PDB file of C-alpha atoms in Angstrom:
ATOM      1  CA  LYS A   1     -24.551   5.661  23.221  1.00  0.00           C
ATOM      2  CA  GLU A   2     -23.644   8.599  20.932  1.00  0.00           C
ATOM      3  CA  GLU A   3     -20.772   9.788  23.129  1.00  0.00           C
ATOM      4  CA  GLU A   4     -19.727   6.125  23.050  1.00  0.00           C
ATOM      5  CA  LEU A   5     -19.653   5.661  19.245  1.00  0.00           C
ATOM      6  CA  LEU A   6     -17.890   8.996  18.597  1.00  0.00           C
ATOM      7  CA  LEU A   7     -15.465   8.068  21.363  1.00  0.00           C
ATOM      8  CA  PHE A   8     -14.784   4.718  19.671  1.00  0.00           C
ATOM      9  CA  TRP A   9     -13.997   6.609  16.435  1.00  0.00           C
ATOM     10  CA  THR A  10     -11.458   8.822  18.195  1.00  0.00           C
ATOM     11  CA  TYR A  11      -9.661   5.730  19.612  1.00  0.00           C
ATOM     12  CA  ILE A  12      -9.873   3.901  16.241  1.00  0.00           C
ATOM     13  CA  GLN A  13      -8.217   6.844  14.481  1.00  0.00           C
ATOM     14  CA  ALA A  14      -5.365   6.853  17.038  1.00  0.00           C
ATOM     15  CA  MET A  15      -4.894   3.072  16.922  1.00  0.00           C
ATOM     16  CA  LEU A  16      -4.558   3.287  13.154  1.00  0.00           C
ATOM     17  CA  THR A  17      -2.372   6.402  13.129  1.00  0.00           C
ATOM     18  CA  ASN A  18       0.169   4.715  15.371  1.00  0.00           C
ATOM     19  CA  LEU A  19      -0.097   1.017  14.384  1.00  0.00           C
ATOM     20  CA  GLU A  20      -0.855   1.717  10.690  1.00  0.00           C
ATOM     21  CA  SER A  21      -3.219  -1.217   9.942  1.00  0.00           C
ATOM     22  CA  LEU A  22      -5.313  -3.556  12.030  1.00  0.00           C
ATOM     23  CA  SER A  23      -7.692  -6.449  11.502  1.00  0.00           C
ATOM     24  CA  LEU A  24     -11.237  -6.321  12.848  1.00  0.00           C
ATOM     25  CA  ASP A  25     -10.151  -8.689  15.676  1.00  0.00           C
ATOM     26  CA  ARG A  26      -7.320  -6.436  16.769  1.00  0.00           C
ATOM     27  CA  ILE A  27      -9.540  -3.276  16.715  1.00  0.00           C
ATOM     28  CA  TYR A  28     -12.217  -5.135  18.653  1.00  0.00           C
ATOM     29  CA  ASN A  29      -9.755  -6.341  21.303  1.00  0.00           C
ATOM     30  CA  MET A  30      -8.143  -2.908  21.737  1.00  0.00           C
ATOM     31  CA  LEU A  31     -11.562  -1.235  22.208  1.00  0.00           C
ATOM     32  CA  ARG A  32     -12.484  -3.941  24.734  1.00  0.00           C
ATOM     33  CA  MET A  33      -9.312  -3.441  26.725  1.00  0.00           C
ATOM     34  CA  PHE A  34      -9.110   0.388  26.569  1.00  0.00           C
ATOM     35  CA  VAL A  35     -12.721   1.514  26.207  1.00  0.00           C
ATOM     36  CA  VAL A  36     -15.201  -1.228  27.244  1.00  0.00           C
ATOM     37  CA  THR A  37     -13.176  -2.180  30.363  1.00  0.00           C
ATOM     38  CA  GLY A  38     -11.363   1.172  30.235  1.00  0.00           C
ATOM     39  CA  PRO A  39     -12.323   4.315  32.191  1.00  0.00           C
ATOM     40  CA  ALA A  40     -15.183   5.060  29.758  1.00  0.00           C
ATOM     41  CA  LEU A  41     -17.004   1.823  30.635  1.00  0.00           C
ATOM     42  CA  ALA A  42     -18.555   1.872  27.119  1.00  0.00           C
ATOM     43  CA  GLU A  43     -20.178  -1.246  25.624  1.00  0.00           C
ATOM     44  CA  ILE A  44     -19.691  -2.639  22.117  1.00  0.00           C
ATOM     45  CA  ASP A  45     -20.096  -6.035  20.504  1.00  0.00           C
ATOM     46  CA  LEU A  46     -18.414  -7.366  17.423  1.00  0.00           C
ATOM     47  CA  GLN A  47     -21.295  -7.162  14.950  1.00  0.00           C
ATOM     48  CA  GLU A  48     -21.962  -3.530  15.801  1.00  0.00           C
ATOM     49  CA  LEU A  49     -18.281  -2.725  15.470  1.00  0.00           C
ATOM     50  CA  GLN A  50     -18.030  -4.407  12.082  1.00  0.00           C
ATOM     51  CA  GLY A  51     -21.101  -2.541  10.825  1.00  0.00           C
ATOM     52  CA  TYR A  52     -19.574   0.688  12.109  1.00  0.00           C
ATOM     53  CA  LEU A  53     -16.179   0.195  10.407  1.00  0.00           C
ATOM     54  CA  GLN A  54     -18.039  -0.769   7.216  1.00  0.00           C
ATOM     55  CA  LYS A  55     -20.025   2.463   7.291  1.00  0.00           C
ATOM     56  CA  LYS A  56     -16.696   4.276   7.763  1.00  0.00           C
ATOM     57  CA  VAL A  57     -15.267   2.500   4.698  1.00  0.00           C
ATOM     58  CA  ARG A  58     -18.366   3.366   2.611  1.00  0.00           C
ATOM     59  CA  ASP A  59     -17.912   7.028   3.531  1.00  0.00           C
ATOM     60  CA  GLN A  60     -14.190   6.792   2.802  1.00  0.00           C
ATOM     61  CA  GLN A  61     -13.162   7.671   6.344  1.00  0.00           C
ATOM     62  CA  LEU A  62     -11.492   4.237   6.369  1.00  0.00           C
ATOM     63  CA  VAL A  63      -9.885   1.901   3.809  1.00  0.00           C
ATOM     64  CA  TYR A  64     -10.331  -1.895   3.884  1.00  0.00           C
ATOM     65  CA  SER A  65      -7.788  -3.882   1.898  1.00  0.00           C
ATOM     66  CA  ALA A  66      -5.895  -7.156   2.225  1.00  0.00           C
ATOM     67  CA  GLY A  67      -8.206  -8.182   5.083  1.00  0.00           C
ATOM     68  CA  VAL A  68      -7.360  -5.168   7.287  1.00  0.00           C
ATOM     69  CA  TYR A  69      -8.348  -1.544   8.040  1.00  0.00           C
ATOM     70  CA  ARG A  70      -6.288   1.559   7.397  1.00  0.00           C
ATOM     71  CA  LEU A  71      -6.678   5.316   7.372  1.00  0.00           C
ATOM     72  CA  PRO A  72      -6.853   6.830   3.896  1.00  0.00           C
TER      73      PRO A  72
ATOM     74  CA  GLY B   1      -3.419  -2.817  38.530  1.00  0.00           C
ATOM     75  CA  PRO B   2      -3.023   0.842  39.699  1.00  0.00           C
ATOM     76  CA  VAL B   3      -0.336   1.633  37.156  1.00  0.00           C
ATOM     77  CA  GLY B   4      -2.403   0.066  34.396  1.00  0.00           C
ATOM     78  CA  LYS B   5      -5.394   2.113  35.631  1.00  0.00           C
ATOM     79  CA  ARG B   6      -3.271   5.241  35.472  1.00  0.00           C
ATOM     80  CA  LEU B   7      -2.135   4.421  31.906  1.00  0.00           C
ATOM     81  CA  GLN B   8      -5.726   3.766  30.830  1.00  0.00           C
ATOM     82  CA  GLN B   9      -6.580   7.225  32.138  1.00  0.00           C
ATOM     83  CA  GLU B  10      -3.546   8.824  30.395  1.00  0.00           C
ATOM     84  CA  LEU B  11      -4.727   7.190  27.153  1.00  0.00           C
ATOM     85  CA  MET B  12      -8.260   8.542  27.523  1.00  0.00           C
ATOM     86  CA  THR B  13      -6.961  12.021  28.385  1.00  0.00           C
ATOM     87  CA  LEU B  14      -4.801  12.008  25.256  1.00  0.00           C
ATOM     88  CA  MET B  15      -7.736  10.743  23.120  1.00  0.00           C
ATOM     89  CA  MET B  16      -9.998  13.506  24.428  1.00  0.00           C
ATOM     90  CA  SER B  17      -7.413  16.296  24.201  1.00  0.00           C
ATOM     91  CA  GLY B  18      -7.208  16.783  20.416  1.00  0.00           C
ATOM     92  CA  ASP B  19      -3.618  18.132  20.413  1.00  0.00           C
ATOM     93  CA  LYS B  20      -2.335  18.722  16.874  1.00  0.00           C
ATOM     94  CA  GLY B  21       0.395  16.543  15.397  1.00  0.00           C
ATOM     95  CA  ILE B  22       0.850  14.239  18.342  1.00  0.00           C
ATOM     96  CA  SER B  23      -0.650  10.813  18.972  1.00  0.00           C
ATOM     97  CA  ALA B  24       0.159   7.585  20.788  1.00  0.00           C
ATOM     98  CA  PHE B  25      -1.368   4.185  21.525  1.00  0.00           C
ATOM     99  CA  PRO B  26      -0.501   0.975  23.369  1.00  0.00           C
ATOM    100  CA  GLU B  27       1.324  -1.327  21.044  1.00  0.00           C
ATOM    101  CA  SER B  28      -0.751  -4.461  20.759  1.00  0.00           C
ATOM    102  CA  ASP B  29      -1.236  -6.309  24.044  1.00  0.00           C
ATOM    103  CA  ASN B  30       0.368  -4.295  26.823  1.00  0.00           C
ATOM    104  CA  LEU B  31      -0.591  -1.044  28.400  1.00  0.00           C
ATOM    105  CA  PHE B  32       3.155  -0.962  29.172  1.00  0.00           C
ATOM    106  CA  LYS B  33       4.552  -0.378  25.692  1.00  0.00           C
ATOM    107  CA  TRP B  34       3.143   2.223  23.348  1.00  0.00           C
ATOM    108  CA  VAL B  35       3.941   3.702  19.944  1.00  0.00           C
ATOM    109  CA  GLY B  36       3.780   7.469  19.559  1.00  0.00           C
ATOM    110  CA  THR B  37       3.736   9.722  16.521  1.00  0.00           C
ATOM    111  CA  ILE B  38       4.916  13.287  16.425  1.00  0.00           C
ATOM    112  CA  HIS B  39       4.697  15.683  13.465  1.00  0.00           C
ATOM    113  CA  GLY B  40       7.042  18.647  13.246  1.00  0.00           C
ATOM    114  CA  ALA B  41       5.318  21.962  13.961  1.00  0.00           C
ATOM    115  CA  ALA B  42       4.527  24.397  11.143  1.00  0.00           C
ATOM    116  CA  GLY B  43       7.198  27.055  10.785  1.00  0.00           C
ATOM    117  CA  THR B  44       9.955  24.745  11.979  1.00  0.00           C
ATOM    118  CA  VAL B  45      12.472  22.861   9.803  1.00  0.00           C
ATOM    119  CA  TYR B  46      10.646  19.632  10.805  1.00  0.00           C
ATOM    120  CA  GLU B  47       7.365  20.677   9.237  1.00  0.00           C
ATOM    121  CA  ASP B  48       6.074  17.937   6.948  1.00  0.00           C
ATOM    122  CA  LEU B  49       8.139  15.275   8.754  1.00  0.00           C
ATOM    123  CA  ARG B  50       6.723  12.660  11.053  1.00  0.00           C
ATOM    124  CA  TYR B  51       8.453  10.409  13.569  1.00  0.00           C
ATOM    125  CA  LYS B  52       7.399   7.241  15.411  1.00  0.00           C
ATOM    126  CA  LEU B  53       8.606   6.765  18.985  1.00  0.00           C
ATOM    127  CA  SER B  54       8.469   3.888  21.467  1.00  0.00           C
ATOM    128  CA  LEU B  55       7.369   4.513  25.044  1.00  0.00           C
ATOM    129  CA  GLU B  56       8.036   1.780  27.617  1.00  0.00           C
ATOM    130  CA  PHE B  57       6.659   2.011  31.172  1.00  0.00           C
ATOM    131  CA  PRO B  58       8.906   0.361  33.799  1.00  0.00           C
ATOM    132  CA  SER B  59       8.018  -1.311  37.077  1.00  0.00           C
ATOM    133  CA  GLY B  60       7.766   1.697  39.361  1.00  0.00           C
ATOM    134  CA  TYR B  61       6.042   4.007  36.890  1.00  0.00           C
ATOM    135  CA  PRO B  62       4.726   6.843  37.462  1.00  0.00           C
ATOM    136  CA  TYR B  63       7.687   7.427  39.851  1.00  0.00           C
ATOM    137  CA  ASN B  64      10.222   5.943  37.464  1.00  0.00           C
ATOM    138  CA  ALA B  65      10.297   7.814  34.160  1.00  0.00           C
ATOM    139  CA  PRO B  66       9.163   5.972  31.028  1.00  0.00           C
ATOM    140  CA  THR B  67      11.852   5.057  28.469  1.00  0.00           C
ATOM    141  CA  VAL B  68      11.112   7.028  25.290  1.00  0.00           C
ATOM    142  CA  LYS B  69      13.132   6.638  22.095  1.00  0.00           C
ATOM    143  CA  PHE B  70      12.753   7.614  18.464  1.00  0.00           C
ATOM    144  CA  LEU B  71      11.994   4.603  16.290  1.00  0.00           C
ATOM    145  CA  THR B  72      12.197   6.794  13.154  1.00  0.00           C
ATOM    146  CA  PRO B  73      15.855   7.955  12.863  1.00  0.00           C
ATOM    147  CA  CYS B  74      15.746  11.585  13.869  1.00  0.00           C
ATOM    148  CA  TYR B  75      18.496  14.057  12.930  1.00  0.00           C
ATOM    149  CA  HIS B  76      18.384  16.553  15.837  1.00  0.00           C
ATOM    150  CA  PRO B  77      20.923  18.151  18.247  1.00  0.00           C
ATOM    151  CA  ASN B  78      19.344  16.373  21.261  1.00  0.00           C
ATOM    152  CA  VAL B  79      18.855  12.930  19.765  1.00  0.00           C
ATOM    153  CA  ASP B  80      21.484  10.216  19.472  1.00  0.00           C
ATOM    154  CA  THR B  81      21.897   7.558  16.785  1.00  0.00           C
ATOM    155  CA  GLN B  82      20.115   4.940  18.893  1.00  0.00           C
ATOM    156  CA  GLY B  83      17.021   7.150  19.199  1.00  0.00           C
ATOM    157  CA  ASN B  84      17.795   8.331  22.750  1.00  0.00           C
ATOM    158  CA  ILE B  85      16.572  11.810  23.660  1.00  0.00           C
ATOM    159  CA  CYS B  86      18.275  14.234  25.995  1.00  0.00           C
ATOM    160  CA  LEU B  87      15.227  15.933  27.498  1.00  0.00           C
ATOM    161  CA  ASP B  88      15.242  17.186  31.123  1.00  0.00           C
ATOM    162  CA  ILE B  89      11.746  15.931  31.986  1.00  0.00           C
ATOM    163  CA  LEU B  90      12.711  12.382  31.035  1.00  0.00           C
ATOM    164  CA  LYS B  91      15.512  12.201  33.577  1.00  0.00           C
ATOM    165  CA  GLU B  92      16.117  14.593  36.470  1.00  0.00           C
ATOM    166  CA  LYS B  93      13.048  16.757  36.052  1.00  0.00           C
ATOM    167  CA  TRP B  94      10.612  13.790  35.725  1.00  0.00           C
ATOM    168  CA  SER B  95       7.494  14.438  37.813  1.00  0.00           C
ATOM    169  CA  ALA B  96       5.022  11.705  38.755  1.00  0.00           C
ATOM    170  CA  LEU B  97       2.237  14.067  37.548  1.00  0.00           C
ATOM    171  CA  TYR B  98       3.542  13.989  33.949  1.00  0.00           C
ATOM    172  CA  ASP B  99       1.535  11.981  31.493  1.00  0.00           C
ATOM    173  CA  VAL B 100       1.990  10.702  27.944  1.00  0.00           C
ATOM    174  CA  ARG B 101       0.430  13.804  26.446  1.00  0.00           C
ATOM    175  CA  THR B 102       2.940  15.978  28.331  1.00  0.00           C
ATOM    176  CA  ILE B 103       5.845  13.915  27.134  1.00  0.00           C
ATOM    177  CA  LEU B 104       4.738  14.072  23.465  1.00  0.00           C
ATOM    178  CA  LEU B 105       4.128  17.819  23.572  1.00  0.00           C
ATOM    179  CA  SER B 106       7.551  18.330  25.170  1.00  0.00           C
ATOM    180  CA  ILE B 107       9.334  16.274  22.504  1.00  0.00           C
ATOM    181  CA  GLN B 108       7.431  18.054  19.740  1.00  0.00           C
ATOM    182  CA  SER B 109       8.548  21.327  21.279  1.00  0.00           C
ATOM    183  CA  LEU B 110      12.155  20.075  21.519  1.00  0.00           C
ATOM    184  CA  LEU B 111      12.134  19.582  17.691  1.00  0.00           C
ATOM    185  CA  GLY B 112      11.777  23.310  17.012  1.00  0.00           C
ATOM    186  CA  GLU B 113      13.818  24.496  20.034  1.00  0.00           C
ATOM    187  CA  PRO B 114      16.775  22.216  20.676  1.00  0.00           C
ATOM    188  CA  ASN B 115      19.175  22.768  23.566  1.00  0.00           C
ATOM    189  CA  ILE B 116      22.497  23.386  21.847  1.00  0.00           C
ATOM    190  CA  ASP B 117      24.459  23.400  25.113  1.00  0.00           C
ATOM    191  CA  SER B 118      23.513  19.728  25.685  1.00  0.00           C
ATOM    192  CA  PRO B 119      24.054  18.016  22.261  1.00  0.00           C
ATOM    193  CA  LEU B 120      23.812  14.283  21.615  1.00  0.00           C
ATOM    194  CA  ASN B 121      24.492  14.999  17.938  1.00  0.00           C
ATOM    195  CA  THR B 122      27.250  17.559  17.459  1.00  0.00           C
ATOM    196  CA  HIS B 123      26.941  17.689  13.674  1.00  0.00           C
ATOM    197  CA  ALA B 124      23.299  18.692  14.033  1.00  0.00           C
ATOM    198  CA  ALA B 125      24.057  21.106  16.848  1.00  0.00           C
ATOM    199  CA  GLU B 126      26.648  22.917  14.697  1.00  0.00           C
ATOM    200  CA  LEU B 127      24.460  22.904  11.601  1.00  0.00           C
ATOM    201  CA  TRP B 128      21.426  24.203  13.486  1.00  0.00           C
ATOM    202  CA  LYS B 129      22.492  27.855  13.185  1.00  0.00           C
ATOM    203  CA  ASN B 130      22.077  27.612   9.417  1.00  0.00           C
ATOM    204  CA  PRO B 131      18.395  26.712   8.974  1.00  0.00           C
ATOM    205  CA  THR B 132      18.243  26.447   5.134  1.00  0.00           C
ATOM    206  CA  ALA B 133      21.283  24.085   5.155  1.00  0.00           C
ATOM    207  CA  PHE B 134      19.942  22.233   8.194  1.00  0.00           C
ATOM    208  CA  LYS B 135      16.542  21.787   6.580  1.00  0.00           C
ATOM    209  CA  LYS B 136      17.984  20.592   3.262  1.00  0.00           C
ATOM    210  CA  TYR B 137      20.250  18.072   4.977  1.00  0.00           C
ATOM    211  CA  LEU B 138      17.426  16.923   7.370  1.00  0.00           C
ATOM    212  CA  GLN B 139      14.914  16.432   4.506  1.00  0.00           C
ATOM    213  CA  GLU B 140      17.327  14.752   2.155  1.00  0.00           C
ATOM    214  CA  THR B 141      18.599  12.290   4.842  1.00  0.00           C
ATOM    215  CA  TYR B 142      15.119  11.564   6.302  1.00  0.00           C
ATOM    216  CA  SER B 143      14.501  10.167   2.817  1.00  0.00           C
ATOM    217  CA  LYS B 144      17.804   8.187   2.870  1.00  0.00           C
ATOM    218  CA  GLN B 145      17.102   6.636   6.266  1.00  0.00           C
TER     219      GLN B 145
END
């Protein structure tokens, strides 16, 4: 599970670097397509993901504004 | 699909590789169109500049080369006004073993070492030999466009 959640963070950072801002729904769907059903075969559900992004925003690794997530 | 499987694997490889100043990711829905980001390497005139690129994967990929273009206007000897890149590995030297990471590292390398004998921008090719003037013009027109 650890390798999973750190892996998710790597993909989340790249998604945001390239696409600049994303809603929870878009992050969720990209992780499902490229990680959950991707070669990693790593499971995540929406509540867990939201809690995770929220912990990232608390720790200022992520910004949440105007309903979407961004890198600081 | 097999090509989609391949591109999923290329994505994971890039995610795990930690290469500095390059990144990419499928643009919304499709595995078949991505956005990349390349930062100029330290020591080069492109240091501190970053460029977005589009990568489109055709029917026939990996055997047919992906179409890669700068989205951010890039003033470079080997780049045209439309964002097209003259890079050997994207046309005649394309190998079906190449992946996204390879393409991004090659373009990043092309920034600091252009091929002046094969210019798509002659102004830039001629200015290249004068790096303080090139850098000033590059930086001041990156800001304009």
